[PDB]
Amino acid sequence: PVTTATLGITQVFWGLDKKLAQRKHFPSINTSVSYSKYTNVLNKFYDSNYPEFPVLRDRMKEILSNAEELEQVVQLVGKSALSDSDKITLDVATLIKEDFLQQNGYSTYDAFCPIWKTFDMMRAFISYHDEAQKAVANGANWSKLADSTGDVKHAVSSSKFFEPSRGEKEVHGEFEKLLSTMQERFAE
Amino acid sequence: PVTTATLGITQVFWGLDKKLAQRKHFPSINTSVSYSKYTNVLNKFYDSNYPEFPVLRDRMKEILSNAEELEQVVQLVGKSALSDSDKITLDVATLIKEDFLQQNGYSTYDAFCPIWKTFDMMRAFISYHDEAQKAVANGANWSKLADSTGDVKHAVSSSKFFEPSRGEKEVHGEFEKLLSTMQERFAEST
């Protein structure tokens, strides 16, 4: 009853899952159920500061929902002859869950992820997903593409290890190289 | 609530499953949930009188657990992919359930199985399982081994019919011949 009343009254809900908590997948936010009613208001601030933030957030929500549906279908049907794009979405969402929605709040590097750093990480993840999608749609096999771009995937993973204490100028430049490296793999 | 409080306070829990209560499988003891906490303290008596009793009981318990897992996986995925060892475990545990674990308390032979008879029959069943495992690991196909040793299997499964009224000396004398014949019938077949 207290949860229901608070859920009806409040505007944001950061639901937590015991299954994710026990696996030490903190902050353990239940993405399916969690919601925020302040995105409509915050479109103005995002257009002022980081114009691409709402689009990237919607893209990541869509990717996570599609990958949840695909994971349910995989659990149902043994992942038999999964589509290349479906495998891309599954891999990208697993990477997002393991390197963007999982941060140790007590670790020095990931205690505080500022808005600029998290926006750059969101853009890096979305660019990686888009590059994989476009390259496979061109004709590249996903297995060979992953074998070739494991270095870029590890760089995107280490983007969570990037220290925000270096300031915006240093961190933003570091992500600029990551986009350049990600674009370089697209040509190959 | 009564069952929960009783399980919290008592030391021995002989759970009964109605699935085995039907199909006339008495005692319908659920070997998965039942437990006894006096097995540790009873090691003194077991080492004094029947030293191999705890080891045989543990071997039978692990055989039953392995067969429970095998039956669980088979009931949904069939038995067309089991290994020879898995087939041996399933067959021996079905034999244990059909002959050893089930006891007809209203039959003269199985009204009262004393401790020595129970220990000897555990020895017989465990020796049967070990001999089958060794023979198959030697290279013998399990189907052909079962076809050749159906007589030994019947002799083991019919060991319950040995009336304890004959006495410890007579019943144990027949059981010693049962193991010796079973060992021979597993070496000649292999």
Added chain:
Amino acid sequence: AEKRTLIAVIADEDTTTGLLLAGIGQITPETQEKNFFVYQEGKTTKEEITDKFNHFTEERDDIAILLINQHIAENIRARVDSFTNAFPAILEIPSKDHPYDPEKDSVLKRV
């Protein structure tokens, strides 16, 4: 698999000669083994033919497709039935004066 790149022939002498002319079968010099072994009813025995077929199916991993004559497969019917593995494939080609029998086909029996 990609490793299995060969054609096994255990048919009669004429069919073995035809397969050799086609070039599917050959004898490996280093391995001292022949992919296509000539065997007839008079030559060797049923047990030898069954052993050769088993070696081609399992020991000779390079063999991908096995070509066995219907007359040869008749004496190796038990081995053909036991060879339930898809790889390598087994084909019951007809021999000289021995037309192919649909009933004797192991693959067609599963239908």
Added chain:
Amino acid sequence: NREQVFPTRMTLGLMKTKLKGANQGYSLLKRKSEALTKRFRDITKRIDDAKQKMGRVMQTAAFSLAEVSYATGENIGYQVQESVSTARFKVRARQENVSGVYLSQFESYIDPEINDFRLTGLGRGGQQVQRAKEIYSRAVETLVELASLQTAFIILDEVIKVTNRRVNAIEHVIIPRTENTIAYINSELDELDREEFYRLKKVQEKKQNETAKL
């Protein structure tokens, strides 16, 4: 016949989600089984046609080989066996994606390293030997195609059997099991609600008695 799940609202919701997923998987796997069964029937028809064609091609190749041997005046089998150092014909497996299965398809190839045949040293009938070799190569290609079709049919049969077993298991085991678990959980929470209602009714009776006394 029920899952060992502790009766709770979270458990009830998890089991409803499990039941919905089980029904969805049942429908999807039944449809996949139907598609693979259509593909397997097509593969069986193609296998029968390929067996007939392979029999005809084998008869033609046997006739051609007999004609070549008659023209040459001797059996070229010994010479062919002697010149068997390397195989000119090789087959490479290809992982074709037919429906939801990944049945491998054999792809024949010709190696020009040892493409030379035993025409030299045959004595006579070189043209007949070459024609017989070409006919035998065509028959070998047809046999490779038939073997690939048979392997695909066997793989599809195994996959269809596994899928049908999975559908039957899902339905008969899981759906009664999950439905019985849902029923048991609903009954248990109904019992807890009834006990709470009785306790509240006793509280109301005590309060009413106290109010009447006062």
